[PDB]
Structure formats: structure tokens, C-alpha cells
Amino acid sequence: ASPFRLASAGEISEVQGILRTAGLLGPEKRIAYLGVLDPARGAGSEAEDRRFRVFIHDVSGARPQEVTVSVTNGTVISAVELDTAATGELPVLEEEFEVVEQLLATDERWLKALAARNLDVSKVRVAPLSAGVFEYAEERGRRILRGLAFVQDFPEDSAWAHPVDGLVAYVDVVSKEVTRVIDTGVFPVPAEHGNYTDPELTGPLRTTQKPISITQPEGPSFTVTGGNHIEWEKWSLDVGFDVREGVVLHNIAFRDGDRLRPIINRASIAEMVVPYGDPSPIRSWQNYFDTGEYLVGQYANSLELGCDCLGDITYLSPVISDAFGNPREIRNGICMHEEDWGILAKHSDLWSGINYTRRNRRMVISFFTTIGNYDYGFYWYLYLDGTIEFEAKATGVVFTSAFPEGGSDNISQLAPGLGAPFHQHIFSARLDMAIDGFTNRVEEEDVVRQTMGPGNERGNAFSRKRTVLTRESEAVREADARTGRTWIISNPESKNRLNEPVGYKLHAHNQPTLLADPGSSIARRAAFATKDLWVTRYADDERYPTGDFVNQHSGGAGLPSYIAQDRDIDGQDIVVWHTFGLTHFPRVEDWPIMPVDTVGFKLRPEGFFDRSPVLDVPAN
Amino acid sequence: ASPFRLASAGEISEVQGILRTAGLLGPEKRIAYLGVLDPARGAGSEAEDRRFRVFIHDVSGARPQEVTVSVTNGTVISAVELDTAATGELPVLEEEFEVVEQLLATDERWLKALAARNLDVSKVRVAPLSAGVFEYAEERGRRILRGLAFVQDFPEDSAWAHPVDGLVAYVDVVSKEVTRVIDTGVFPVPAEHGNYTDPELTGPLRTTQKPISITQPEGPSFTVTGGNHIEWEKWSLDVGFDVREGVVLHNIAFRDGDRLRPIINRASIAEMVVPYGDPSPIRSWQNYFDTGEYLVGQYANSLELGCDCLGDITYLSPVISDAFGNPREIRNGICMHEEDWGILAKHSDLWSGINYTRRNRRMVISFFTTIGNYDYGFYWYLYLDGTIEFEAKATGVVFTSAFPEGGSDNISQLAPGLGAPFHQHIFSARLDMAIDGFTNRVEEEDVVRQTMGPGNERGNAFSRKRTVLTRESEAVREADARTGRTWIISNPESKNRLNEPVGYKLHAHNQPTLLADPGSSIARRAAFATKDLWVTRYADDERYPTGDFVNQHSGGAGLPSYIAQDRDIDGQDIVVWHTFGLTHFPRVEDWPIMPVDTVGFKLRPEGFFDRSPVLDVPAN
């Protein structure tokens, strides 16, 4: 069996047993993260050894532990106690979400704040939000969540339409104490509902949409073997799933004639941060690390046939661990299908008389996650012509506030009295490259303009330049859309038939990066998001751009510390980290439920093949 | 009934009869352009007066004429004799292209150049290309084409694989004279063939692609009335066709409740320039104005069901004039269909228990044109959520040269001895805006970064600023991807329910603009291409960014001359001109036939609606 196969329910049950017998999984213990470890570097790695990494939380207040288990041999490999004031707290537990609202419901200060606003405590929902690191010295070493309140007029009401501004509370979820309740003043609670299924708001549903039927009468063109190995139109890869990162792609390769040629060893979205740009003290701390703090894989949706995924769909149902080590299946959590993608190539030639048209198609691997008010779709696309593309789709309900009388420079008005603070959604793609093998390098390619004069007498010439990034200290790069800047990952030891190194070109969308002040807490904790491109030398413990323990970590972990080793990256085993994001000034059309907006990146072959790789596509 | 209906064969025959009766279309005359004029401003106006504009060429060398005729009344409205050395030559005629190869085949200088290369003149194809304006004083006032040679080994051979470098000739196509033959030296003719249907090159065709079937059992959701009026999912528009511009969209409007709200009065691609960046004297003059010089609508393909357009397709077959005034139908030249477009909106709410998913779709209007080696697809998209998007798809065969022995800074190597010069493909979209009516203004929106300090103590705030463009002299704008720059077209006299002006936001791709030296001939003739955004006050005669007569015209017309009027554009009838393009450094994978690459722009509502406009979309 493949070492890259999905974790099975049986594997997770064995991890639980091993931890139990070792004395590491008592009634006070909770599993905050569990995932399978990738095989170590080894082109001849023979014996099967499936190992799992576990973060163990203690609800009584004892120190948490990081444990590595071998399910193959049934042993604990290492177990380290963690000093969370130094290295960061563990990810937020699903069961800690409920605790915030219930603790506040009995706090005298919370109740007095609600009574001043004539709000029934039974109708006040509390969003439990990650705390970050700011000025409160008493929070160092404690698990803190912060809570913001929303009113639910009835059980099916959309609470996001009724933010309770001017009020925030901080809670220690281990000792179960409310540390602070801050009331900065009374704002009216917006009264309009935002119930997008209420006929009063939708009006009569349209009757004009006729069905679109997409079928594959002979079944799909791809095959799935060993549970998660995909072969499709010369592509070969393994579809993994991790509770923190979500869908992970392994061993992406392309069959060029008789040879299977590697392209990407591992592709994932290794972090995503949602920083808010409202300076009100009610929200100026608000930054979601959806991947690092919340774990986007554990909130993956079950995707419905004909609604979420349309066509001839093949599903995967990944298995994760719950907080006690029991396996939990995410039924239909991953959709896979191919779809038509228009014209691939076309030419009508006057001189030869030949008319030629071929159609394109793409393989789609997707999942959707829901973190509170937000819903995100993650889509990986493989195209016939060798292009690889990632797309994030952002939808859900925007996070709301009051709209202040007299307006705001940092908040959009969506409805009478209802605001939506400005924010960004910034992703980090971790691309462990393997262009024809592991000896790779990155070049930055800029367009070069030339001045009219000798050798360019008509002033028409233009050119390009490539700069090799040779060391990590010079491999932190910024976009430059005006000069057409792209980055090429090549293998200097593998040449095409023209004797040039084979390569792939990364095309970014060139959206703005992190806008916060460079001195801010979020700029230190999300340093990856301040630059478009980072290149590191591969190391097996350098997994996330924000470090292993993001929750309440003081800053600098991850990419800034990796880069500081200043390692050789010129013709080496390297990892590309690409930052890309959406800057969201909410519009009235985003309310009461937001239409999808998108961002992504793509990689295209650049002299990887000896000619077009789609000459053998049939005419249809 | 509709004044925006497509021209009919009868109208074109009637124009021919009117011109003949008036003495303007004798046997020495040729129609170089014929198109219907849009109604003048005034909702109602002329009851029905269909007017046509005609450019009449004279093959005996007499001066050409611009003529306006009323087909309704059977009259010539105006006829002006043109001074082409001043205002520009007429577009190239299809019959002039054939002249070039035939004239050169009997020229002693051409024959000696081919004899020096051991080439058989019967196998040498000549690409006839527009001449531009350079240093040759004898070309002023004459219709010139320039020829580059390619060898065709046999009648079905792709001649583009065999460029004859070092050789170019200039031809007067009216007096039938070869003016100059320039031979800068013998280059080897690349010998490899580029025949992408030859099994020796394709290999065995794939048997792995299973069919994808897209059908609409109840027919499409849009209706077509009056030949070219579309209603689809609250959108309303008319699809026009012009032999110069191709597909033109008129009267784009959205039905919001019981109000039909205008958005765009007229949308077209009003110019497209393809400048080459090779400083060799054999090619340094090479710039295609596909729209203005060649007329892209004239070369539209007939699109094949199931190959070019897949699904439940509705076709339009526009009628154009040939060079004698006879109607010519372009059968199946426009495809229209709706497409599934994934998730529209999605949210699973923990507090209400409601799970909500809706799917998106788009309406597609497309045509394809072939100009020599290149093929371009023009796609207009309408989405459920009010988004409008344009996409250009570039494919075909790249233009080739020899690859010099010691390499090149301006040419890519594609195959042994075979080069492809660097070039760009740059488009100008002309958007005659009508956001809720004709009183519009444009604002430039930049993100604003804020420094940590008083009122921003945690350094997290960020904002935006909008700058109104009030006069034409300040409305020539550049992109700035780093600051997230976009442009908003709003109506200051039409407010949404929050008392804010309704608007649409233009999102650019922020690709490089024209790279040539600003002193060059092409920078003067294609001045529009040097900036991303221009805004003018509407005027009936300001139709193209390059002026009416582009062929062999120096600078002095087009957008720089319009802008000098410095007209008020703050709440007025305005036109937005957006430049966007691809910079093409050809790759090996582009050879021997290029996979599609794309570029475009989109417009999204920005407080145009009072809430999401897709709340009434059904589940299905």
C-alpha cells in the first residue's frame, strides 16, 4: 500500500489505544491536532512506517504535549512537554467554543452590560474568537478566547444582522474565568433581519432558470486506485487530507512519453489569515488564522451532489480524530471531477487549408470549510496543457459591527445602522518543488524596456532579465505588476531538447499584501503575509509559515526564523511559499449573504516540454 | 422595429443600389468598410432612420471617399473626398493581400534573393502585412504592404515553420510596383516541419478522454427576439456586429424589480495592436492594428457545433458587405449559450442550523477571428450577480524568424534554428457608460495604509481614498496593483437605499502596457496603449482610440487629440477606454500550435443594488 494513503478509521483507533496504554490519554486529556507524517526524504524508502503527530491538551491545566506515534509498530516514538508561554498555545478546541457564551451568561459585568441594552441573555450569541498577543501581561501562558456578541431574535434568525457593538469580553477557558469585560458605550443594535431564506426578503423565487445537465455517459476519464491515487490525462498524483491544512496534493507528476516526470512534491495551503482593519478597541485585536488557530480541515462540509458538486462526481470521505481519539468520517468531504474548459487550441490556415480546433478540460479537486460566519472553497485544477492552478472562493456572511453615526474610514455600511469592518483574506501556498527532480532553483523574471538608439533605431525593442536567487537571505521577494514580474522554478541539471533548463513559471495575481503597520502585532505574527514570495531550503520540520503553534504566539515564528539560516538554494531541494490574498471593502451586494469572490495563482510550463504537450489530443 | 437590429442582406443590397444610383460605386470602386451607425442621442428621436457609413476605395488611384447613406430614405447624406497623406489610408482590402506574392514572383530582385538561398519561388509564401509609418518618404500617400517570406514544402505544409529571414519587400498595391527589396544576408531556413496533424509528430492519439455531455432538456433560459435582443436572468441587451469591431453590445441593462436599469450603453473592443519587439530591420516595423487596419469582423470564423461551441447553442449569422457591396453571410459566426459557473453563495450557520447553497451561471457571447497566423476569441460574460466580464483568448501559430547562431535578447528559440520574436497583444475596450442613466463620473480608488499611533494604537487600521476625475486632462490614469487601484463609475444623481451613489467597479488585470520607447512610431500611433485608463466626454465622432483611418497614419488622431478638449466629465455622458494586454515571450510549449492564453477585465456592482441581487435564485 502507498505511504501516502489517507488515514483510516482503524489507524486512528490504534493511535488512541497506543496513547491510552502509554498513559497519555486520560480523562483530562484532549486531542487538539492529529495527523499523519509524510515519509522522510528517501528515493529508496522501503519499510512501511506510518507515523502520526499528536498535540495533547490538558483541561486541568497541566502542560500540553507533542507526541509522535508509530501505528505500524504500536509505539510512542517521542513525547515532549510544551512550555506554551515560549512556543505558543495549542489550536482552539471545538468544545471551547461553547464555553465562552456559557461563562459570560453568569458574569455580573456581562449581564449588566446586556441589561443596559435591554437584551435578553438567552438570545445573545457569542462568537468565540482567537486572542492574539497584545498588551495584557496576565494572558501570557494562559489559553484566552475573546468574545463578541450578536442577538438572535429567534432560533432560525441570522445573528450576524444584529451585532452588539461597544462590548467585548476576554475569557480564560481553562480556569473558566472572565478576565475582562470592556464596555465602551451603547450602540443601537441593528434591527433589520438578514434571513436570506425568508420570502419577505427574497421575494418570489425566479421561475426562469432552465436546467443544465452535465453527464459523462461512459464515466469519467480519471481513475482512482489505492483510495486516493489519481491518474488523469498524463497527470499522476495522490490526494491527501490533513485536519489543519485540508486537501494536500502529493507527488504531482506528468507522464511525458515513457517517463513519469515529477513537478511538485507537496502542495498545500499552509496558512490563511484574516486581519481586520477597524481601529476600534472592540475589534482592533481581531485576526483569524483559520488554518493555524482553528484547523480548516476539521470544519470541512459534506458536499451535496447536484448542489455543491455538479456532474459525474467521485467523492473521498476523509477520516479525522475527534477530541478523544475516536475516528470521525467527513462524508463526501472532497469532490473530484473533470470539466470542459473551452477551446484548447485553434487555427484556420489560409495557405495549408487545414482547420484545426481542440477542446480543453480540467481536473477539479475541491473541498469547502465553514469557520463561523465565513465559508471558503479550496479548488485545485490540473489542465491538459500542463498548467496547475489554485483558486480560493470566499463566501458566507460578512462579519458585522454597528455603523457609527457620522460615518467611518474603516467600516462599510450594509444596511441602516449595520456596518462591516474592512479586512483582508490572505493565503500562503507551500509548494515543495520537484521540477524533474529535487535539484531546483528560482529565478525572478522582469520585463526590460530598451531606449531608442544604436541597435534599436526604431525604438521598438524590449527584452527580459532573469535573476537567480542563490541564498535564503535574498529570496524574500515582492511583486511588481508594472514590470510583468514572474518567478521561474527550473532544474539546472535537466535540459530540454534545445539545451535549456526545464522550468515552470509562477503567475501571481499581484493583489496587495498585508496592510497593517510593520510594527503591529499582526505583522510580526503573520510576517509571511508581508511579502509575495519566499524560498527556503527544504527541512522536514519547517511545515508552516507561521510555525507549529500559532495561537497566542508572540511573533517571529515560521518563515522569518527559517530564512535567517541563509541556506544555499541554488540547485537544491527547495520550497516556494507564495502569499496571495483578497482585500475586502464590503459592498451592499455582499449583504445578507455574500456572492463568491475569488483569488489564486497558477503555474505554467516554461520549456519543461520539447513542444506542446497536447498534440495528441483527439479532434472530438 | 428595433434601431439596434443587425444589418440585413437587404439593407446592404440597398446601400449598394443607393451608391450606384448616386454615381459613387462604379466599376473602379471598392467598399473598404461598411457599417450601420448608432442612433444619435435622444430616446426616441428619429422613429426609424437606418444610416450606414461607407469607406470607398478607388483602384485607379483617385481619392477615396467617406460616405453616409440613409437606407430608409434612399439618399446619400454626405460624401467627403479624403486626403490620405493627411488623415490616413483606408483599411486593407482582402483582394490586396493576394497581390503581394504575385507581384514579387516576377521581380528580379526578389528572384535573385531566393536564388541565393536555393529556394523555389513556387514554394515561397509571402505574408502581406500592414506597413506603418517610418522613414520612407516615397510611401506618403500610397497604399503599401510589406512582405515576409515563408517556405511551404508541400500544399498542406505549415509555412510558419520555415521563415526566410534576412529578406523583406515593400509593395505599392495600387500601382502594382515593388518599391524596395531589402536583403540583409542569408539565414538558414529552419528545416523541421510544424505539421500538428501529422501522426509522426502527434504520435498515437489519446484514447483516454471520455465524453462530457452538456445538454439543456428544456432548452436555454434566455430568449432571443427581434433577431438580436437577449433577455436572460434579469439582463437585457442587444448583440450588434460590425465588420471593424466585431461583436458590439448595446443597451446592457438589468431588471431590478420593476425597473429596467441601464448599466452600459455600448461595449466594444475598439482597437487591438500587436507590436513586435525584435530590433532586426527585417521586422522592426511590424505592428498589427487588427481592428483598425485589417477589420477583425471581416475574418470571423464559422463556429462548429460541439467543437467551437459546446452545449445548447444559439447562433447568430451576421451579414457584412464584400468589396462590391454584395451581402455576405458569416454563417454561425456568433455563439450564445449559458454555462454553469460553480457556487454562487454558500453558508452553513451553526447558530440558526440553516445550510444554504446556490449555484452560479453565466451567459456567454463569443466569436473567433483569424488574421494570418493568429486566431483570437472574443468572449463577453454576464453573471447572475451583476458582474460583466470580457475575456480575449489568443491561440494560433506564433510568428517566427530564424534563431541567430549566437542567441538573442529579443527572440525565443522554439526548435533548432527557429525563433519567435517577443511581442505584445494589447486591446482597447470602449465602454460608453450609462450607470442608471447618462449622468456618470469616474473615481479612482486606492487602498490607504495607516501608521501606528494615536487613533490607531495597535497599527491594524487601513482605509481607502477615492479621487473624482473632473476633467479630461486629469483622466489619463495608470494602474497601481500594489495599492489595489480600481476605478468606480457612479451616478451622483441616483442613490441606493443608504443614500450613496450607485456604481460599478472596474477590476483590471494590471498587465504591462506598451513597452516601446515613447519616441517610437508605434508609441505615437498607439498612444492609447501607453496608459491603462482614459475617460472622455461622449461625442458621436469619437469612435476609435486610434482614429478613423489607422493604416499608414502618423500620430495626431485618436485619444490624445480627444483629451485635449479638456471637457467636463463630472456627472456627464462619459466613455471609459481601458487598455489591457498580454506580453508574450514565446515558450517551447507554444510550438507548433499555441495553447490558449487569456487576458481581460471585469466590472462588479458597487452599491448599485440595495442588497444582494441573487436572493431570489432557487435551490433547483
Ligand SMILES: [Cu+2]
Ligand atoms: Cu471578506
Ligand SMILES: [Cu+2]
Ligand atoms: Cu503572442
Ligand code: NA
Ligand atoms: Na523541494
Ligand code: NA
Ligand atoms: Na456615456
